[PDB]
């Protein structure tokens, strides 16, 4: 999937990925900010 | 299919074999489609036959 | 039931190169990994090595990979220790373990009755016994003895009940001395590293 | 105005990032041209 955006001030901040998104497989989680980003894939039980 | 390396194999029953059973080990029998190349499934929900 | 058990105590002088003898029965002495484990006195546990008896495959700790070595018998289940060039400090309780079904391969699930090894140059010295406003109790001196596993019963084992035995004293000129004691009779101290057997009466 | 581009890629287990930044002109956004992305980010992690 290709991505792009032009908001200002970088308010988006990362992207999520799986194939079921509650907890019952593994899945992707990509979070951003000002000092360090955190890659982990792991079974996430993703909000709504 | 087009994997380059090396795999390494060996006997290993003097290791991970005991007279009781060695029940730490399992492995994927049902499933609803194929494996990926490198792709790991740890799902343990019941496959409906 | 299964057992396991070692050799008996030996106490020998440095270079000597002694051996320790391991039996175990009831199980398959072919697919459990056997091994012995080091305790210095005052310390702990020290890890040698362990054998699988179904063939020649050894493993041995870095700290240990020519120091001593491990083999055993599978024709007799009998496990074996040998030693060269012994030292001063090669001086510890030896406790021998298997595998067991309790967790994977290296874990250590049993364990022996342990052996001690004592390794000195006093070429081990005998004992000496001697007997001790009681009105009452009686008890037996033992002194000028080296080795440490000295045991002493009274009447032949007869008398257990009030029997009372008090740690041993390291004298100053270098030998140990204890006494026991039995609620109110010839007490028998036996020198096993010596087979010494001394019988005196109160 | 900043214009971001990304691009998430998995295939035979391995997840791929690229990512590009073009400054552009406030007139449209997404405006002709190539920008060519460069790879960042190249992991493993074998799920769906």
């Known amino acids: 999937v290709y991505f792009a955006s032009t908001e200002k001030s970088n308010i988006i901040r990362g992207w999520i990925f799986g194939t079921t998104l509650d907890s019952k497989t593994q899945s992707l989680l990509i979070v951003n900010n000002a000092t360090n980003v955190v890659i982990k894939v792991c079974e996430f039980q993703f909000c709504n | 299919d087009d994997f380059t390396g090396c795999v390494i194999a060996w006997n290993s029953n003097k290791l991970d074999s005991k007279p009781s059973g060695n029940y730490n080990y399992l492995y994927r029998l049902f499933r609803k489609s194929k494996l990926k190349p490198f792709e790991r499934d740890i799902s343990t929900e019941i496959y409906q036959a | 039931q299964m057992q396991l058990v070692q050799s008996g105590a030996e106490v020998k002088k440095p270079g000597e190169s002694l051996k320790i003898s391991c039996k175990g029965s009831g199980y398959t002495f072919s697919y459990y990994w056997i091994g012995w484990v080091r305790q210095m006195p005052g310390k702990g546990l020290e890890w040698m090595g362990i054998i699988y008896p179904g063939d020649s495959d050894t493993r041995y700790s870095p700290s240990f990979q020519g120091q001593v070595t491990i083999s055993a018998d599978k024709s007799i289940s009998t496990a074996y220790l040998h030693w060269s060039s012994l030292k001063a400090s090669d001086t510890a309780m030896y406790y021998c373990?298997?595998?067991?079904?309790?967790?994977?391969?290296?874990?250590?699930?049993?364990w022996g009755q342990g052996t001690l090894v004592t390794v000195s140059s006093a070429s081990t010295k005998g004992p000496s016994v001697f007997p001790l406003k009681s009105t009452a109790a009686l008890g037996c001196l033992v002194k000028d003895y080296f080795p440490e596993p000295v045991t002493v019963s009274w009447n032949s084992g007869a008398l257990t009940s009030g029997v009372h035995t008090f740690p041993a004293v390291l004298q100053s000129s270098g030998l140990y001395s204890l006494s026991s004691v039995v609620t109110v009779y010839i007490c028998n101290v036996n020198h096993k590293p010596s087979n010494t057997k001394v019988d005196k009466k109160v | 105005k900043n214009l971001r581009e990304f691009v998430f890629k998995n295939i035979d287990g391995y997840f791929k990032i690229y990512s590009k930044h073009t400054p552009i002109n406030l007139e449209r956004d997404l405006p002709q041209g190539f920008s060519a992305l460069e790879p960042l980010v190249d992991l493993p992690i074998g799920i769906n």
């Open positions: 373990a298997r595998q067991g079904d309790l967790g994977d391969w290296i874990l250590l699930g049993y």
